[PDB]
């Protein structure tokens, strides 16, 4: 079966054969589409086919499919599975695996960079302090004084599901959120529940608007422990505007390193529940969602007042007007401080090219339109006009429950 | 099987049961989602009629009544006899209002029950069609106080006698390809503008020429008619800040009227069913004006605002886009022509969703189309999970007439 997708701005039509290799399910059926839905222990029984499928891919990519090296490896893994009920990836397979999980992440607009990924192997890690050290080295490496480099650190895989390694933070670097008695919120409202856990676990919160959260790290299924990332490793950027000099007085800043720490990496049926990764920001992640979402810092009003916009009628488009200036401020500040950042035009144009390339060389590129299209100025970026097919390939990054809902506390 | 939708801005959860009535197919599978793809006999007929009549009678609280049973019989008899059947006016109105109600891509459905339905099933000729459309235009425009309407021409018989309006909208500007290589007017209409000429139109080769109507009746060859100018309400576009804006020469029309869709009610097919509402500002300002394959005016407006167009990172496209849309809304409001902004419209849709979940058990919605083409995440619908599925009665796409017409 072949499937065609069309760009309605250019008439470019592409054909997808890659989707045939999709094993996992979408959430959709023939009768219902769940394309806008946010969220729609393993036996030796099912593991070897998963291993084999992965190893077949890997050996295909290195042009050694069917080789003695390939056959010996399948044999080796098989034996290790029945002998030990799991198996260990080689370094080469781990690296390939991580790169491909990124490559397959249909919700990531940054995938043109997929092949340049620094993979840190932390599978020898045994304790939380061990985890802290690895994470520090990641932040410092990835930050690179503002010249950001993509990186992932991979802690040991799941065994019985009772010995999981987990980073409890959703991102390595994030600001604290504090619910006040008057019901208002100080800092980032998205982080209120997690900030509370930290305080309870002993964190002394400065109780400000931009407090870098501590790391809460769980190793080997034990209770998580707290660590403060050395401030000198946390690159931040004060936000100012190129024309509005009152903008700096809003007291806004953000961190330079966007690093996701709550996902699960699946490779060959192995489950890596602690696999923090980082790239660099598309400006709208900060300027639109982080600053302007009603349920985040929500600075649209304050910025609008200061701009002297007509805020009496929505049809003045005061919100839209302020939104643009804020996103200009973000891009300006980051570029001025020589911290890597990409605007949503540059990023989406690059993704289209990436995508077209992926159709030629690979037969497809799974992509989630709902997430690929930027949260402002959608139709004046080329991805809006691009039909996309969403499906799930492995290796992949998956969601997993927040560990505070699942953890069995030792005490 | 009982699905939940979450709003991630408000944490509100609604439960969807209505999807368990969906009959038609989505294009998606369990292996692959096609949510962003634009276009994914007597024995056939009676169950279709039955499903419809059942819901119609259920809606009027006479489910399983004698009237219900009788009608069911009567229609069954007619189909068995004539191979087709005819709707009672009451059914027709219901069907059309419900086609709208079920239109998953339409943000304006809170209005769904206030739809003027014009029964034009007695129409026989293209002139007759022209008369009905002018009447529709005048009624719906209403000197700028727009009112929703649909006019419904006779249903398909044997597909040889289809009524079709060839235009995609009752009111659109012409598009001409130049020796220059560039395009004058509306590029989306370049081809249609051609078939107008090839069939007889005397194009004034302007930038904003209201296209003629190309009406096909009873499967016959289609004919041209010029809508009376005084019935086409237009709005000159000015900005409440930039005096230079007027000098761009921009205007748009007030009446947004889709004419190329197929209305399906109880198995019957209405291939000519033009309908109209009123514009959401972004349809004109973002899409019509700023799409590359449309009027593509961003570069010009940017130059006029004197922005640094050297780097994409200055967000000059974004800055211009907002101003343009401010202008669009300003102009319509100034001339008292109904228009709604993306904020109010989406706010209203969220409300309509809450009502539809509460009074009907769901509301099919296509997030890809409901979220506006600008400022997406600062409208509430961005943060709203939506389930998409096809209920009937429905509006469906259908092939462009020139690719099907037996000349
Ligand atoms: C290098 C620059 C990168 C850019 C500009 C970029 C861009 C983005 C953006 C804008 C999102 C949407 C985030 C959201 O709205 O929640 C995203 C999501 C995602 N990215 Fe990237 N990305 C980059 C690097 C990476 C890397 C290095 C990885 C993994 C190795 C990755 C994997 C993912 C995944 C798995 C998601 C989905 C996360 C979720 O579902 O919550 N990206 N990316
Ligand atoms: C009265 C106020 C109305 C508003 C504000 C409104 C809004 C919209 C918008 C913004 C779209 C997207 C169109 C596009 O991007 O191409 C749309 C599409 C649509 N609307 Fe409405 N609409 C209104 C009235 C109506 C009426 C009266 C009907 C039918 C009786 C209707 C049925 C539809 C359908 C079927 C579509 C999808 C058209 C397509 O797929 O090309 N709408 N509407
Ligand atoms: C559900 C509901 N409401 C909100 C959410 C947030 C999803 C988080 N997506 C990841 C966002 C993020 C942050 C930092 N970096 C990156 N990142 C890094 C590389 N690629 C993406 N992504 C989920
Ligand atoms: C599929 C594939 N390639 C291109 C298209 C264009 C879709 C046009 N949709 C209708 C746009 C429109 C115009 C005027 N009025 C209205 N309208 C009126 C009431 N509701 C919507 N919609 C569809
Ligand atoms: C309900 C809807 O799917 C949800 O708000 C999505 C929409 N698109 C998104 N797109 C990105 N990039 N990130 C997001 O968090 C979301 N949220
Ligand atoms: C490929 C994609 O489906 C296409 O660009 C869609 C996106 N969303 C849309 N949304 C609306 N309201 N109207 C459109 O024409 C489109 N086009
Ligand atoms: Zn789908």
């Amino acid at each position: 079966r072949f499937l065609k997708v069309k760009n309605w701005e250019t008439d470019v039509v592409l054909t997808d054969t890659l989707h045939l290799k999709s094993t996992l399910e979408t959430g959709c059926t023939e009768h219902i589409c769940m394309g806008s839905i946010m969220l729609p222990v393993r036996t030796k029984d099912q593991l070897f086919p998963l291993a084999k499928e992965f190893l077949d891919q890997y050996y295909s990519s290195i042009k050694r499919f069917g080789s003695k090296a390939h056959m010996d490896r399948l044999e080796e893994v098989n034996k290790e599975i029945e002998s030990t009920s799991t198996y260990q990836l080689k370094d080469t397979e781990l690296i390939y695996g991580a790169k491909h999980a990124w490559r397959n992440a249909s919700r990531c607009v940054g995938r043109i960079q997929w092949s340049k990924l620094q993979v840190f192997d932390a599978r020898d890690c045994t304790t939380a302090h061990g985890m802290f050290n690895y994470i520090c080295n990641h932040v410092k490496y990835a930050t690179n004084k503002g010249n950001l480099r993509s990186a992932i650190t991979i802690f040991p895989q799941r065994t019985d599901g009772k010995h999981d390694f987990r980073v409890w933070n959703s991102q390595l670097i994030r600001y604290a959120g504090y619910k006040q008695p008057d019901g208002s919120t100080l800092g980032d409202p998205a982080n209120v529940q997690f900030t509370e856990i930290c305080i309870q676990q002993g964190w002394k919160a400065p109780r400000g608007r931009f407090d870098v959260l501590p790391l809460l790290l769980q190793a080997n299924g034990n209770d998580p422990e707290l660590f403060q990332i050395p401030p000198e490793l946390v690159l931040e950027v004060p936000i100012r505007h190129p024309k509005f000099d009152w903008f700096k007085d809003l007291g806004l800043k953000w961190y330079g390193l966007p690093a996701v720490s709550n996902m699960l990496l699946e490779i060959g049926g192995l489950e890596f529940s602690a696999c923090p990764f980082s790239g660099w920001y598309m400006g709208t992640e900060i300027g639109v969602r982080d600053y302007c979402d009603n349920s985040r810092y929500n600075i649209l009003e304050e910025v609008a007042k200061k701009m002297d916009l007509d805020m009496r009628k929505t049809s003045s488009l005061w919100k839209d007007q302020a939104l643009v200036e804020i996103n200009i401020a973000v891009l300006y500040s980051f570029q001025s401080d020589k911290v890597t950042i990409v605007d949503h035009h540059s990023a989406t144009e690059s993704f289209i090219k990436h995508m077209e390339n992926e159709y030629r060389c690979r037969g497809g590129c799974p992509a989630d339109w709902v997430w690929i299209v930027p949260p402002m100025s959608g139709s004046i970026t080329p991805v809006f006009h691009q039909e996309m097919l969403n499906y799930r390939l492995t290796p992949s990054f998956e969601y997993q429950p927040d560990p505070w809902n699942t953890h069995v506390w030792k005490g």
Side-chain angles (χ1 to χ4, degrees), chain A:
Chain A
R1 195 179 320 102
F2 297 83
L3 287 179
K4 306 190 304 182
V5 308
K6 173 161 172 192
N7 191 295
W8 286 85
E9 181 189 349
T10 65
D11 289 289
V12 171
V13 179
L14 304 177
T15 319
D16 189 278
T17 55
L18 183 54
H19 70 279
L20 301 160
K21 305 293 180 176
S22 143
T23 63
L24 313 184
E25 299 171 352
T26 53
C28 301
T29 65
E30 296 69 27
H31 284 148
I32 193 148
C33 177
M34 306 211 310
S36 68
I37 304 298
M38 197 95 74
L39 291 152
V41 48
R42 184 182 242 138
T43 49
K44 64 222 310 171
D45 191 309
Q46 62 257 199
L47 186 58
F48 189 84
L50 292 182
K52 185 196 196 297
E53 165 184 318
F54 170 72
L55 289 164
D56 286 4
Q57 283 176 223
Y58 170 60
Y59 278 96
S60 283
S61 79
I62 66 171
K63 285 206 186 72
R64 297 292 191 272
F65 187 91
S67 65
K68 200 209 170 216
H70 180 192
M71 297 298 140
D72 283 350
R73 183 57 181 150
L74 288 171
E75 244 300 271
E76 187 184 38
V77 161
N78 185 39
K79 289 180 57 177
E80 184 177 349
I81 290 171
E82 55 194 6
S83 158
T84 73
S85 234
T86 184
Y87 73 110
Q88 297 301 313
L89 299 170
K90 299 302 206 193
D91 292 6
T92 47
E93 306 167 340
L94 189 71
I95 291 150
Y96 171 84
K99 282 176 189 192
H100 282 255
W102 183 6
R103 193 184 188 177
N104 289 340
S106 56
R107 293 183 162 168
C108 178
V109 77
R111 287 179 281 172
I112 193 166
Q113 293 287 336
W114 78 268
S115 67
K116 308 90 176 288
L117 174 61
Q118 180 58 232
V119 180
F120 294 113
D121 184 351
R123 289 176 300 173
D124 63 7
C125 183
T126 74
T127 76
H129 279 85
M131 291 177 74
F132 175 62
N133 191 51
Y134 267 113
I135 291 184
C136 283
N137 296 343
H138 178 137
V139 166
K140 188 170 170 163
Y141 175 91
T143 299
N144 191 24
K145 299 186 157 163
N147 184 14
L148 274 44
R149 300 185 279 201
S150 309
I152 180 167
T153 295
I154 306 173
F155 293 108
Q157 71 213 38
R158 191 171 276 159
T159 54
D160 63 5
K162 302 173 184 171
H163 292 79
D164 285 9
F165 288 75
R166 291 297 299 276
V167 180
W168 285 38
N169 315 60
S170 58
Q171 294 177 45
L172 294 181
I173 295 172
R174 262 201 135 169
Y175 298 118
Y178 312 96
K179 205 76 176 308
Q180 305 280 64
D182 71 6
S184 77
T185 308
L186 160 68
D188 195 329
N191 298 325
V192 158
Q193 184 191 23
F194 176 82
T195 305
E196 288 166 355
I197 297 183
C198 289
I199 286 159
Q200 157 169 11
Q201 301 301 134
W203 186 52
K204 301 292 178 274
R207 303 191 49 89
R209 185 147 126 104
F210 297 109
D211 307 331
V212 175
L213 283 166
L215 290 164
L216 192 47
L217 308 178
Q218 158 186 323
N220 205 43
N222 295 308
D223 294 349
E225 310 178 13
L226 285 167
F227 306 90
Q228 174 195 119
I229 299 166
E232 69 261 33
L233 262 38
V234 185
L235 191 65
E236 295 179 284
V237 174
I239 304 306
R240 61 277 190 188
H241 193 279
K243 300 185 198 291
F244 304 153
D245 190 79
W246 51 258
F247 203 99
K248 67 182 194 307
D249 299 308
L250 296 159
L252 303 177
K253 58 172 168 170
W254 207 254
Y255 45 93
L257 185 69
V260 174
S261 54
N262 57 3
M263 303 185 84
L264 184 149
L265 168 62
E266 172 164 22
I267 300 175
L270 305 187
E271 293 174 295
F272 297 92
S273 52
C275 59
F277 61 81
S278 59
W280 50 81
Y281 269 116
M282 180 165 79
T284 48
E285 311 183 58
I286 312 180
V288 188
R289 311 300 314 288
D290 291 338
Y291 281 167
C292 295
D293 263 15
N294 288 332
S295 301
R296 304 288 304 276
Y297 280 76
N298 192 30
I299 70 180
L300 279 174
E301 278 212 2
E302 189 187 2
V303 172
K305 294 196 199 301
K306 297 264 166 41
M307 287 183 64
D308 200 40
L309 292 168
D310 198 320
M311 298 180 51
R312 262 180 293 112
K313 288 284 188 62
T314 60
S315 59
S316 54
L317 302 197
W318 65 269
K319 278 212 179 130
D320 317 64
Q321 229 155 5
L323 179 63
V324 180
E325 298 303 331
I326 285 153
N327 279 271
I328 281 163
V330 164
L331 290 163
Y332 173 66
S333 299
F334 269 63
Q335 288 163 347
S336 288
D337 287 351
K338 305 195 182 72
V339 180
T340 306
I341 196 169
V342 67
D343 70 79
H344 50 291
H345 299 289
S346 180
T348 57
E349 295 158 28
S350 287
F351 178 84
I352 292 302
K353 296 174 170 178
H354 168 61
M355 196 183 165
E356 298 176 334
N357 195 36
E358 288 282 273
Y359 273 78
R360 283 183 265 104
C361 86
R362 191 181 199 206
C365 182
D368 179 351
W369 191 101
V370 162
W371 277 58
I372 294 298
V373 181
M376 67 170 298
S377 301
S379 78
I380 63 161
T381 70
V383 292
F384 179 97
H385 306 269
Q386 181 65 51
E387 294 185 344
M388 304 185 184
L389 288 177
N390 197 20
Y391 49 87
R392 291 162 68 211
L393 303 180
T394 54
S396 60
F397 289 102
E398 302 287 354
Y399 295 119
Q400 48 175 2
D402 299 292
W404 51 90
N405 296 325
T406 61
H407 187 63
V408 158
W409 283 87
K410 273 79 220 174

